[PDB]
Amino acid sequence: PEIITPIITPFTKDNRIDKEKLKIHAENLIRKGIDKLFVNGTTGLGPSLSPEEKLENLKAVYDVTNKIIFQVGGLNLDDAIRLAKLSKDFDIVGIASYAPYYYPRMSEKHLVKYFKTLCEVSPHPVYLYNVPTATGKDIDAKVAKEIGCFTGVKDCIENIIHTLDYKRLNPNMLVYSGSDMLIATVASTGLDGNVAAGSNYLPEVTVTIKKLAMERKIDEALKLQFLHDEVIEASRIFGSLSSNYVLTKYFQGYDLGYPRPPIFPLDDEEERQLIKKVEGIRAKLVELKILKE
Amino acid sequence: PEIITPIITPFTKDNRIDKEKLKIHAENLIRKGIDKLFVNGTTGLGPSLSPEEKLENLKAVYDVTNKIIFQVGGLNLDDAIRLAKLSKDFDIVGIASYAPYYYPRMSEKHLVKYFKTLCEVSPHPVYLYNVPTATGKDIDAKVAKEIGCFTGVKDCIENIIHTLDYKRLNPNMLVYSGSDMLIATVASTGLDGNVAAGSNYLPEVTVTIKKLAMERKIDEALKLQFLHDEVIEASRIFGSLSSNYVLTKYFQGYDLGYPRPPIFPLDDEEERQLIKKVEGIRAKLVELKILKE
Amino acid sequence: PEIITPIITPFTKDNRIDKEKLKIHAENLIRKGIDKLFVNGTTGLGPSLSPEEKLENLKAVYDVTNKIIFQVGGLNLDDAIRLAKLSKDFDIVGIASYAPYYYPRMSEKHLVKYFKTLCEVSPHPVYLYNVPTATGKDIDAKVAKEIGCFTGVKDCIENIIHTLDYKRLNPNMLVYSGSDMLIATVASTGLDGNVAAGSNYLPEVTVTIKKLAMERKIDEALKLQFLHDEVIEASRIFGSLSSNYVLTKYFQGYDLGYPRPPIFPLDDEEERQLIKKVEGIRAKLVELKILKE
Amino acid sequence: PEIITPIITPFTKDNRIDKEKLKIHAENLIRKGIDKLFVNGTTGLGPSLSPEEKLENLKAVYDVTNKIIFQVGGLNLDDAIRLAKLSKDFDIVGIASYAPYYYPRMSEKHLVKYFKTLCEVSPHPVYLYNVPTATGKDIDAKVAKEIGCFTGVKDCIENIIHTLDYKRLNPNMLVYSGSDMLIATVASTGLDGNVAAGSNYLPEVTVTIKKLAMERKIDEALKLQFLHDEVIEASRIFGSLSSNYVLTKYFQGYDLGYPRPPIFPLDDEEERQLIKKVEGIRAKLVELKILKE
């Protein structure tokens, strides 16, 4: 199984993508053992990016690696089609789309047609990005089978029964969990990995949990998983999407600029309180020789 | 109380805003007694529109009437601020915004900051567009009071207790329901009206329910309201954002073009079945001298 | 429209129904204009009562009034049939049942069959007691119509659209809301009334909200309704089902013994704090001549 | 890890516990490799049982094994205290309780006092039976730690993150999942096993999945897990609690009498269709020598 980072998008003070800081971030992640980078996901504020900015993001990361899954979805299908087609020039793993978000009670037929339209035009394998909380609708294993053209799925529902059902109804499909808290479990139960937001800032930990579980050292894996869980929990106190910037600087030593408002940066008191919550975890991780001091 | 139409955005076959159809539609609504038009709401596919298209809609409708509430929200706060400021040269009722959509578990502190930022740059009164199912989070009567700068709220939660709570904690706020099914009830219980998607295709019915209820002919109001309820239910079978187009053409005579994929247009069979579902109600409505032939 | 009290069940110190306290409570409620009494409801801790105790409750209230709805349901259909048959010799308004509770995902077919069984043996009109949060399933206007034998429904779903749909699909059915917060609205919109727990301790308020709304004094109605809303909120702080005992003592003068554990009585600290939060509301209510000093 | 059966309660045609058919069933399960028997759970219609019947069940099963967890909760704490004490003269693994069901919005204070009381009087280890869908409330890892007297937890929430949290916050605690679909996964990820309703009728399947997983043949475990999943899904078509009787007869030979209405027994055509749905699976389990011809 794999650890895939849904890579953060760093913005400048001028609310433009900071390509320099992004390439630095990407190259650290690859050097620390991340298998692939998922570009323009939730964690990368994808829905906050214009079609042109989704492409800009791909180009900056592609300078670093071609191990990219390129998220192109949106509420203007023509733009999503144009991004799928433009990805022909890039030798990447695949493209991806969440379900059309916002609109409630969309018909299954219209959801199916949306995804099939993207497969029709795609020059690469197509991955399902299933984020039911964010989009308001689930594309479960049966609808995924009906759509019939997904090479893989990232399932962000917190219920591994749901995630396992993709593999049961679609045995050739690659199946990942979007949970940071299930890295140990996914690796130990036969699924293909995790698209883990927390690997932005502790890629060392996410990869080590996975290695330990693969080696059937389930107890060590779980004790490290539980330390990772505490960081995730601390990241949610002030909003995880904003907190992920602060944590990546704290743990990895470089900065990722700003988020895009209304994903607002943490203020200096929140930054201090957050670091307070993870100070001790860092020291334990250095002690354990997972982080350089 | 008032009926406010969250007006549909007609698109051309090539997925541009059809300004001529929009103006025809807006004038008909105004002529048929609709009080105000809510522009770039859910029903107008607001989240599907670029800032530039949101401005185009404002300009086209403003050519027809100044009785506009202008919805400007999105996931790029700079764009929302730019639209807010641009509205200064339009003599309209107000601006509005939904909460930042898509992203789950946003901090209340950031939600409050987002809305307060819009209030601070707004040259018109600001309305809260509370659509918790579409955006994933509620801005309830207490958070609204804490934001403190709303002139009104349109509440699309199906719970009239929630809606009355705005009036209770914010006595001077204008409070509307988003439910077509609660026109009779809203007008009877002291609320300020409904922002009703169904008034796109049956403005005569929505206005008439309101008037019957105001006249305290409650039995008459509910009878009409219940016929209007069945049209709403029919519109949901194939997807209501798409069906609203077919139903406007069917009941009002003129067509509104296409929606914007992935809100796909109803096919010929869906349209047949939808008309069959509402044929009877139409003849009933003409019998009652609510619709002409 | 009517006000119906889901009457509290007083228990002694050794955990028996205090028949004498129950009769005093029922007498007061009737004296102050409560139309009917709903016996063995949620608020009376019906689920915590043996069939023998459900019968004792009925016999005690029956000494006071024939304006009784006798709730008989449970998870042993033989007991519910037996209670239904025993009611034959009581001059009462009707019996009622909630859906079988606890068990998730019961088939609709089994749900319908439970209620039709009770209708078949019942010597009185049968009322649907729709408490979906408490039971785990909803019996909506469509299933009610499918069952076909309900004389009325009490709808404790907080969504008045849902409630109105019972009238729309079942025009001859009596339709009550279970919310203390919709007395004004129910009375204004043509529904049949409220089954209001808070009428246990402020019958005078609930009766007065209704008359005001009936007299089309909606603004006075809402100002009183909003006062009542705050008492309801206060009662939730430590648990409404327990708090309901303290507030009856406080507003109406007599105590109602204890609840049945694990519905524990409020300790003395909680009781102090609860009273603190309604003191002001009491003051105003005396000031408005609704309560006696 | 272990497999624990929440044992079905067989009823006679006149709705009394059929003690002899229970003993046959408990005997078969122990013979086929089940580790422990969970008595008076959901699957055994625990909540439909009076205190006397709950004890009847203990006694009958206790003639077969002492490997028993005795569920004793209900909505009268005195009855639950009495069953707990009565357990002193049986040499069993422990007693258990779900949270007080039906009543919504009970304070955490009162929930903690409910369980701590049971611990204060219990002569055996106390297990948490966490069934949030049935009771309407969750007793999560935090609340379970605050209570502080649980030897173990059975977690029926379908979210293994929530299940793992019990062990993270309570490392000495035995932690089971209530899901049949997570037998392979639970064993692979370091949890203590499954309380599986489906082991009533395919104990061979559930024990084998468990063994395959602890042998790190995850591929094989999952192939069998996925076959069992189809059976679980089949069982839900007509109501799983009633279908569990029909499937125990079909797969294991002996019948278990009747459920207790309103858990109604399947009718002849429902039994027909249910068998048609699990016919193929029975074959492949024979072909695999998991089931004898």
UniProtKB/Swiss-Prot annotation, chains A, B, C, D:
Catalyzed reaction equations: 2-dehydro-3-deoxy-6-phospho-D-gluconate = D-glyceraldehyde 3-phosphate + pyruvate; 2-dehydro-3-deoxy-6-phospho-D-galactonate = D-glyceraldehyde 3-phosphate + pyruvate
Record InterPro entries: Aldolase_TIM, DapA-like, ED_pathway_aldolase
This protein's pathway: Carbohydrate acid metabolism; 2-dehydro-3-deoxy-D-gluconate degradation; D-glyceraldehyde 3-phosphate and pyruvate from 2-dehydro-3-deoxy-D-gluconate: step 2/2
UniProt binding sites for substrate: T42, T43, Y129, N130, V131, K154, D155, C156
CDD domains xref list: KDG_aldolase (cd00953)
EC id: 4.1.2.55
Gene3D superfamilies (alphabetical): Aldolase class I (3.20.20.70)
Annotated site residues (Proton shuttle) in this chain: Y129
A molecular function (GO) term: 2-dehydro-3-deoxy-phosphogluconate aldolase activity
Key word Secreted present: no
Top-level class of the enzyme under EC nomenclature: lyase
Keywords: Carbohydrate metabolism, Lyase, Schiff base
Active site annotation, chain numbering: K154 (schiff-base intermediate with substrate)
Transmembrane region(s): none
Temperature dependence per UniProt: Extremely thermostable.
Domain of life (superkingdom): Archaea
Subunit structure: Homotetramer; dimer of dimers.
Family from the record: Belongs to the DapA family. KDPG aldolase subfamily.
Known role: Involved in the degradation of glucose and galactose via the Entner-Doudoroff pathway. Catalyzes the reversible cleavage of 2-keto-3-deoxy-6-phosphogluconate (KDPG) and 2-keto-3-deoxygluconate (KDG) forming pyruvate and glyceraldehyde 3-phosphate or glyceraldehyde, respectively. It is also able to catalyze the reversible cleavage of 2-keto-3-deoxy-6-phosphogalactonate (KDPGal) and 2-keto-3-deoxygalactonate (KDGal). It is equally active with both D- and L-glyceraldehyde.
Miscellaneous field: The metabolic pathway in Sulfolobus species contrasts with the situation observed in other microorganisms where separate enzymes exist for the catabolism of the two sugars, glucose and galactose.
Protein name (database record): 2-dehydro-3-deoxy-phosphogluconate/2-dehydro-3-deoxy-6-phosphogalactonate aldolase
